[PDB]
Design an enzyme around this catalytic site. Structure first.
Site, PDB file in Angstrom:
ATOM      1  N   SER A 245     -15.933  -3.077 -23.700  1.00 14.46           N
ATOM      2  CA  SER A 245     -16.074  -2.287 -24.820  1.00 14.46           C
ATOM      3  C   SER A 245     -16.603  -2.959 -26.086  1.00 14.46           C
ATOM      4  O   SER A 245     -16.078  -3.955 -26.532  1.00 14.46           O
ATOM      5  CB  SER A 245     -14.665  -1.994 -25.216  1.00 14.46           C
ATOM      6  OG  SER A 245     -14.622  -1.272 -26.686  1.00 14.46           O
TER       7      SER A 245
ATOM      8  N   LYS B  24       1.745  -2.916  -9.539  1.00 14.91           N
ATOM      9  CA  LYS B  24       2.852  -3.466  -8.762  1.00 14.91           C
ATOM     10  C   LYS B  24       2.732  -3.322  -7.331  1.00 14.91           C
ATOM     11  O   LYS B  24       3.498  -3.751  -6.604  1.00 14.91           O
ATOM     12  CB  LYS B  24       4.141  -2.641  -9.471  1.00 14.91           C
ATOM     13  CG  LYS B  24       4.714  -3.518 -10.667  1.00 14.91           C
ATOM     14  CD  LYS B  24       5.761  -3.026 -11.425  1.00 14.91           C
ATOM     15  CE  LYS B  24       5.809  -3.838 -12.801  1.00 14.91           C
ATOM     16  NZ  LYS B  24       6.497  -3.326 -13.761  1.00 14.91           N
TER      17      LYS B  24
ATOM     18  N   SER C  57      13.003   2.287 -10.613  1.00 16.83           N
ATOM     19  CA  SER C  57      12.677   3.673 -10.411  1.00 16.83           C
ATOM     20  C   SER C  57      11.522   3.877 -11.308  1.00 16.83           C
ATOM     21  O   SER C  57      10.959   5.296 -10.775  1.00 16.83           O
ATOM     22  CB  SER C  57      13.907   4.418 -11.186  1.00 16.83           C
ATOM     23  OG  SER C  57      13.910   4.047 -12.423  1.00 16.83           O
TER      24      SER C  57
ATOM     25  N   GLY D  18       6.837 -11.555 -13.440  1.00 16.79           N
ATOM     26  CA  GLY D  18       6.462 -11.966 -12.043  1.00 16.79           C
ATOM     27  C   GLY D  18       4.747 -11.754 -12.273  1.00 16.79           C
ATOM     28  O   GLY D  18       4.129 -12.454 -11.448  1.00 16.79           O
ATOM     29  N   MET D  19       4.282 -11.067 -12.879  1.00 12.33           N
ATOM     30  CA  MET D  19       2.876 -11.176 -13.053  1.00 12.33           C
ATOM     31  C   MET D  19       2.453 -12.143 -13.813  1.00 12.33           C
ATOM     32  O   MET D  19       1.340 -12.964 -13.190  1.00 12.33           O
ATOM     33  CB  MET D  19       2.267  -9.540 -13.477  1.00 12.33           C
ATOM     34  CG  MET D  19       1.053  -9.750 -14.299  1.00 12.33           C
ATOM     35  SD  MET D  19       0.177  -8.241 -14.898  1.00 12.33           S
ATOM     36  CE  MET D  19       1.177  -7.828 -15.899  1.00 12.33           C
TER      37      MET D  19
END
Ligand SMILES: [Mg+2]
Ligand SMILES: [Mg+2]
Ligand SMILES: [Mg+2]
Ligand code: NA
Ligand code: NA
Ligand code: NA
Ligand code: NA
EC number: 5.1.1.18
Lengths: 322, 315
Positions: free
Chosen positions: B28, B53, B76, B178-179
Site C-alpha cells: 500500500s 488457521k 468455535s 502458535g502462529m
C-alpha cells in the site's frame, strides 16, 4: 474507424504506467464453485484513488491540449464529483496543476465536503444544464483548463483500455472479460484493446436492469440513452452510453448481461464476505452478471473469465441500509 | 530444543501445500508513507476458511486404524471453522461442542458443523467432547499448543521469505502464540538476521509481560478486547520459543486496533478482522517508530477476515 485505436491505448499505457498500479488478479475457489467457470478478478479497487478511473484521467491530463495555441493544460475541469472527479483531481495534482469541479448549488453537503477533501476547487452553478455548461466554459477559459468528460473523451477511453493490456498479460488463457458499463468508457477501451490483440476473447458488459440503456441500445441497434435519471445502488453506472463509446460497443462487445438490484446487492455482499474485498456495489455488477441465469447461455468453452472489480470507493456505514 | 523445529515446519509445508492457498503479498503506497517503511502484507485473510488457521488444522488432521473418523474441539471461531473444513477435505464429519446465542448456533450450521449440545459449564463441555471423541473414534486438536498446529502455522514464514526476499522483519499478532512460535522457529532457522516481532493488545498483554518478566505470566482473567482471536494466553509449548526467538513485543490499545482496522478497510479495501488489525496498529504505533531504520522491508501478517459486517456498526 473508431474514436480511439489500439495505438492510442498503448500510447496511454506509456503515458500513465509510471504513476498507476499494475493491480493484481485474484482468484476465488468459492466463486469458481458457484459459477462452474474459472474466474479471475482484476482488482482495480486497489488502484490509486480507489478505482480504475485514474487511468483515463491521467492520460487525459498528459495528452489533451487546452487550445490550438497552447499545448499545455493549465487546469482541469469536470462536472463529475465521484470516482472521475477524485481520479482527475489526483491526476492534476501529479501534474502540478489545479483541478476544478463544477458543482450544482443543489447537490448534497456530503458531496461538497468530499470534493474539497480530495483537493479540488469547487465552482458553483445553477442546477440547470445551461448553468453547468456556462460556468464550466467560463472556468475552462479563465484558467486555460481542459474539460475532461468521464466517459466520452477519447483520451479517457484510451486510458481505461489499458486495463485489458494488463489482463491479457496476467491471464494468458482468458476466454472472456466481464466489464460493468455506465457511460462505456471502460467497456469501449477494453473492447478496442481485446479485439485488436486477441479477438477470439469475448468482451461482455454487465449492466443494472434499472439503468439498462446499453442493453437496450444494443438490442435496438441504435443509441438509446436513459430517458430519466436511473435509480440503482450501482451509483457509478447511472450515466448513459454516448456518441463516442456507442459505435465501439455496437461493433466490438459480444453481449450485455443485465442484473437486478437484488442480484447486485447479493453479489456485492458475497465478494465482501467470501473474498474479503471491499468492492463498491457498482463493482458487484460484473460479479452479478456472471452469477446470473442468462450467463448460463454462454458456451462452456468460455471457461476462463476475468471480471473487472472496478472500484472500492464505498461508505462502509452506508451498507447497513441493505 | 523446543516442541517443534524447522524440520516439522518443512514436513507441514509438504503436508498441506496441495490444499491451501499460497496467499499473495500486497503493498500500500498510503501505509508506507504513514510509517516510513516498506510494508508487505501477507494476505492470510484470503486463506481457505478466512484465516491462516487452516494451515495448522490441516497439518494436525493429516499428521495425527491410524486415521481419524472425526474431529471435535473447544474452539468455535476461526480454529473451529478451520478444523471443520479440514474435516471436510478428509471426508469426515466434524463435531463442535455447543451449550444447550442462537445467532452463533445458526452460524456454526452454516459452515457445515454438526452440533453436539451440552450443559453450559466447565465439566460438561469437556466431558461431552471427551467420552464425543471416543464414540466417533475422532481427534482432539488444540488451537495453539499442539505441535502439528504450531509447525503448520510456521509455513506462513516459508512463503513470506520467498515472496519477500529482502524482508527485514515480520510482524505477527499473538494469542496463544502458535502462529508466533511457528514463524519464529522458521525465521530463525532460515534467515536469523530477519527480525520477528509480536503485536498484542494492551487489554491482553500476557505475552508482553511474559517477555519482560522472563517467565510465563498468562492473563489472570479472560480478557475483554475487540481482538477476539487473541484472547488466549501463551502456553507451556509456545512460551519457550517466544522467550528465545522473538525479537520484541509491541502492545497496542483498543483504539489503535480499531483505527488500524478501519484504515485497512478504507485505504487498502481488505476486509480484515480486528484481530488482524493488531499487527498493523503495532507498526503504526509510537513505540514502533523507535525501530532501527536498517529494518525497512517489513512483512505484516493479515491473519484473518472473518468479521461479521453487520456488527461493524457497534464500533
Ligand atoms: Mg480458451
Ligand atoms: Mg446503463
Ligand atoms: Mg495476550
Ligand atoms: Na488498430
Ligand atoms: Na433506466
Ligand atoms: Na462514479
Ligand atoms: Na464521435
Amino acid at each position: 474507424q473508431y474514436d480511439i485505436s489500439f495505438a492510442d491505448v498503448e500510447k496511454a499505457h506509456i503515458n500513465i504506467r509510471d504513476s498507476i498500479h499494475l493491480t493484481p488478479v485474484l482468484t476465488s475457489s468459492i466463486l469458481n464453485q458457484l459459477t462452474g467457470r474459472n474466474l479471475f478478478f482484476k482488482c482495480e479497487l486497489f488502484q490509486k484513488t480507489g478505482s480504475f478511473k485514474i487511468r483515463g484521467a491521467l492520460n487525459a491530463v498528459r495528452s489533451l491540449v487546452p487550445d490550438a495555441l497552447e499545448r499545455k493544460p493549465k487546469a482541469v475541469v469536470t462536472h463529475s464529483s465521484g470516482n472521475h472527479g477524485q481520479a482527475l483531481t489526483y491526476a492534476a495534482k501529479l501534474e502540478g496543476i489545479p483541478a476544478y469541479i463544477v458543482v450544482p448549488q443543489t447537490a448534497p453537503d456530503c458531496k461538497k465536503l468530499a470534493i474539497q477533501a480530495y483537493g479540488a476547487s469547487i465552482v458553483y452553478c445553477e442546477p440547470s444544464d445551461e448553468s453547468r455548461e456556462n460556468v464550466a466554459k467560463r472556468v475552462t477559459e479563465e484558467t486555460e483548463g481542459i474539460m475532461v468528460h468521464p466517459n466520452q473523451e477519447p483520451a479517457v477511453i484510451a486510458g481505461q483500455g489499458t486495463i485489458a493490456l494488463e489482463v491479457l498479460n496476467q491471464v494468458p488463457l482468458v476466454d472472456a472479460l466481464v466489464v460493468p458499463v455506465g457511460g462505456g468508457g471502460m467497456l469501449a477501451g477494453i473492447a478496442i484493446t481485446v479485439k485488436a490483440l486477441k479477438p477470439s476473447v469475448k468482451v461482455y458488459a454487465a449492466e443494472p436492469s434499472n439503468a439498462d440503456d446499453c442493453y437496450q441500445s444494443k438490442l435496438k441497434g441504435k443509441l438509446m440513452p436513459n430517458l430519466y435519471p436511473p435509480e440503482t445502488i450501482a451509483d457509478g453506472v447511472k450515466s448513459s452510453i454516448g456518441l463516442n463509446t456507442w459505435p465501439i460497443i455496437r461493433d466490438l462487445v459480444d453481449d450485455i448481461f443485465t442484473v437486478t438490484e437484488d442480484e447486485i446487492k447479493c453479489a456485492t455482499q458475497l465478494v465482501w464476505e467470501r473474498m474479503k474485498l471491499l468492492i463498491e456495489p457498482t463493482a458487484g455488477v460484473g460479479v452479478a452478471a456472471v452469477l446470473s441465469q442468462h450467463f448460463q447461455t454462454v458456451s462452456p468453452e468460455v471457461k476462463n473469465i476475468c471480471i473487472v472489480l472496478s472500484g472500492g470507493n464505498v461508505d462502509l456505514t452506508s451498507s447497513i441500509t441493505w
